[PDB]
Curated annotation (Swiss-Prot), chain A:
Family from the record: Belongs to the MoaE family.
InterPro entries: MoaE_sf, Mopterin_biosynth_MoaE
GO molecular function terms noted in the UniProt entry: molybdopterin synthase activity
Entry protein name: Molybdopterin synthase catalytic subunit
Curated annotation (Swiss-Prot), chain B:
Family: Belongs to the MoaE family.
Pfam families to which the protein is assigned, alphabetical: MoaE (PF02391)
Xref: SUPFAM superfamilies: Molybdopterin synthase subunit MoaE
Entry-linked InterPro entries: MoaE_sf, Mopterin_biosynth_MoaE
Listed GO MF terms: molybdopterin synthase activity
Organism expressing this protein natively: Aquifex aeolicus (strain VF5)
Record's subunit section: Heterotetramer of 2 MoaD subunits and 2 MoaE subunits. Also stable as homodimer. The enzyme changes between these two forms during catalysis.
Protein name: Molybdopterin synthase catalytic subunit
Keyword field: Molybdenum cofactor biosynthesis, Transferase
Role this protein plays: Converts molybdopterin precursor Z into molybdopterin. This requires the incorporation of two sulfur atoms into precursor Z to generate a dithiolene group. The sulfur is provided by MoaD.
One Gene Ontology biological process: Mo-molybdopterin cofactor biosynthetic process
Binding locations of substrate: 40-42, 107-108, 123, 130-132
Pathway per the UniProt entry: Cofactor biosynthesis; molybdopterin biosynthesis
Amino acid sequence: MEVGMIPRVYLGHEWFGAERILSEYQVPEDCGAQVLFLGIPRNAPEDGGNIEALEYEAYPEMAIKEMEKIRQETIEKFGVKEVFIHHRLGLVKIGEPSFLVLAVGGHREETFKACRYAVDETKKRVPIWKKEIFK
Amino acid sequence: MEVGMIPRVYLGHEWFGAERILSEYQVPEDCGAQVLFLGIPRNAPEDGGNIEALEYEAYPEMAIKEMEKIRQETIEKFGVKEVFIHHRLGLVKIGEPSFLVLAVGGHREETFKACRYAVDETKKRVPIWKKEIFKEGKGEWVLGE
Ligand SMILES: [Cl-]
Ligand code: NA
Ligand code: NA
């Protein structure tokens, strides 16, 4: 995707990815910590080990609005400088990240907390659900 | 540079970087989470003035061994599948990562804990000495007679 600036909140069938975000985002002089979480579809033995991919769907408008709300809360609550919350829609192969959260802050203490908060809240409140694709 | 495999523990003047590591590393089928921490030199005016860079020095062998010990501990204590612990030596300009820790595991819970553990334990136990390299004009921040 070609954009003027990488969106902080993204929900779509395309993807920017950790490499591009980390490469393009300029860390502010007052920030000394970045904590990135990548959620990846698994094909663990406990699920049969026959999963080839996951298909993600959502209520697009509702989801992105709630995602932005969580981002706002994360920044205000932990005092970090920036937070990215991205999630893919459509087909996602096992091993490919489908969920991304990047927190940028002054120190690691609050940056780790910020990332974990955004990740946990997103899972509890954002309307995005998966479907397994077998074989 | 030094692939084949990227060394899980690395200490030197060169740098693999998060982009290359995330790009090359293949996530195992039983892993659903990756937690990456990047430590970056920051300008700390509360330390006397504006900083240009952070310098890191050490006796590599000793530092590397403790880093490897911490890595093994992280994997064992948290049950994660893989852990990378990298750190740069020499001068690192503000904004450029100098410390990297990547934990790969089954779920969020243990992966986050593992990364935090490796990071905290490294800062407490690994003998890498740091020095803030201030920009010219430091004497202007605190003025007496
Ligand atoms: Cl909607
Ligand atoms: Na990614
Ligand atoms: Na890096």
